[PDB]
Amino acid sequence: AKTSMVAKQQKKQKYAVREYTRCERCGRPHSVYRKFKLCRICFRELAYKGQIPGVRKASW
């Protein structure tokens, strides 16, 4: 399922209107943004490591 249909997005899909964007540390198609191609949760952890750019969390 996931590892087979991640090559469907990483290579040319039969129907590329499907947009089956998975991730590498998550098998996630349903929390992926345009500039991320990654789930909101593992990006949140490596927002606390400095691979995604500088994004603050609390104190508003």
Partner: protein, 97 residues
């Protein structure tokens, strides 16, 4: 000329635009003062839960910080501010001429 200095935080683009507003100040230039442009932020309104729990929504922040510096006297014995590489971390070379 429109040397817009741009980064994520201001405190990196402060000293980065303070690199170009100072090294061209000692040059033969007529630098416009530091007049930063309106700086857009971005709310990434994710939901704070994992699968079910609504009324759990987390906002995020990422900023761009545009500035406005323009000098009006180009001469090759002075312009080491602009051609000489200094601080390319956040500073993409927005050297319009």
């Amino acid at each position: 000329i429109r040397i817009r200095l741009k980064a994520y935080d201001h405190r990196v683009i402060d000293q980065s635009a303070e690199k170009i507003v100072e090294t061209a100040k000692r040059s033969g230039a007529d630098v416009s003062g530091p007049i930063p442009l309106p700086t857009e932020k971005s709310v990434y309104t994710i939901i704070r839960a994992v699968h079910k729990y609504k009324d759990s929504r987390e906002q995020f922040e990422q900023r761009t910080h545009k500035r406005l510096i323009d000098i009006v006297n180009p001469t090759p014995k002075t312009v080491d501010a602009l051609m000489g590489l200094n601080l390319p971390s956040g500073v993409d070379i927005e050297i319009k001429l």
